[PDB]
């Protein structure tokens with residue numbers, strides 16, 4: 363039974379309980395432990411079942427999870443969360459498969475990761491939403507990554523739309539860099555492709571601050587009227603400890619409740635970073651930390667006054683920020699939808715291949731000085747994306763390798779790169 367967690371839907375710039383029609387406010391906490399590189403606590407009952415009683419004590423209705431393993435089952439933990447009225451916001455990426463902010467690509471390999479997570483998690487009514495990225499652009503030196511994130515939002519939403527699944531919204535989580543934040547917010551709702559919701563990692567309020575002095579009043583005025591639901595995807599500056607979490611009183615108070623859809627404290631687990639509200643001891647048990655009681659009391663007190671779906675309904679294109687060198691370099695034109703079938707054709711017909719099974723940079727420099735690599739380049743500043751720029755890194759390399767091989771024209775099965783990962787593709791010899 364998922365009865366205690368009816369699906370949440372979006373209307374305008376607010377979330378609503380699809381059953382009751384009442385506005386949904388996130389009272390959340392990030393929940394992520396740190397042969398996958400990441401640990402998927404939601405795939406392991408002995409972990410989630412240990413923590414849910416403590417999560418219940420805190421009074422949260424939402425978790426943010428940054429990484430799941432889509433090859434594992436999640437029904438036990440997802441059902442156990444639902445039985446306690448808890449929802450999940452989930453990143454689609456993982457640390458080893460994410461859009462690289464310094465050298466961005468939107469390709470078949472990352473898109474396949476996104477689809478796998480969607481197919482693993484979409485059956486659960488308590489899946490609140492998916493993030494198609496987290497703090498990808500994080501300052502003025504990497505704004506050209508944002509078009510790739512926008513393409514990911516577009517493609518994730520279309521993949522969901524064309525699937526049998528409930529239409530779980532797809533949004534974005536951003537940092538709070540002063541020089542880029544206005545542009546980022548506009549960009550993710552500009553043109554034809556928009557985030558469904560927008561989360562900000564918000565650490566402006568530290569210690570015993572106030573609505574006016576923290577910056578919260580300024581942020582609230584800035585996001586007034588923003589066309590999609592907005593919330594604090596993280597909060598909980600730890601400058602002053604134990605964290606009193608008095609920001610929670612402001613966030614759910616009258617002024618902010620009309621703009622913000624709540625937020626998620628960072629975070630459940632203590633990881634030698636002084637951000638946890640619990641610490642897992644040597645016996646694998648939960649040791650409650652001084653912050654825990656303060657977060658619990660603040661959430662307990664928080665009673666946001668929202669508006670109902672029906673009354674919101676009877677109440678009611680964004681220009682993309684211009685480009686300026688060194689300041690804002692995210693083109694409105696987005697990379698294409700990665701095409702697994704097109705790219706899979708490279709695996710089959712190319713004479714020279716590099717297996718996935720430091721290296722990449724060196725080989726690109728070598729090959730791209732011998733052949734024209736335009737067809738695999740992706741430029742988020744100028745909005746120029748080569749025909750195979752959506753293929754995997756190895757496919758892109760193999761293409762250039764094969765071009766060089768054909769340019770040489772020796773036709774002797776010697777691929778012109780000495781490396782154990784290079785091979786001649788015998789299928790290339792087979793006529794289609």
Ligand SMILES: OC[C@H]1O[C@@H](O[C@@H]2[C@@H](O)[C@H](O[C@@H]3[C@@H](O)[C@H](O[C@@H]4[C@@H](O)[C@H](O)O[C@H](CO)[C@H]4O)O[C@H](CO)[C@H]3O)O[C@H](CO)[C@H]2O)[C@H](O)[C@@H](O)[C@@H]1O
Nearest residue numbers: 394396428429453455456457460461462463464496497498
């Ligand atoms: O900056 C250039 C380098 O970028 C490298 O790729 C990164 C990629 O590693 C990153 O993965 C993110 C994680 O960093 C993120 O961690 C969460 C934290 O952001 C948060 O503060 O704490 C939680 C809980 O502890 C962390 O899990 O998790 C998300 C979701 O799984 C991952 O997407 O993403 C960056 C932007 O997409 C990306 O640039 C790249 O590997 C390097 O080569 C490059 O030098």
Ligand SMILES: OC[C@H]1O[C@@H](O[C@@H]2[C@@H](O)[C@H](O[C@@H]3[C@@H](O)[C@H](O)O[C@H](CO)[C@H]3O)O[C@H](CO)[C@H]2O)[C@H](O)[C@@H](O)[C@@H]1O
Nearest residue numbers: 500537538539540563564565566567568575576577601
């Ligand atoms: O500079 C880039 C950096 O910005 C970080 O966001 C900052 C906030 O950290 C900062 O918060 C200030 C508090 O630390 C201080 O104690 O109080 C003052 C107000 O009196 C706060 O402003 O506020 C600025 C501007 O609002 C933010 O830009 C981001 O978390 C981080 O993502 C980014 O790298």
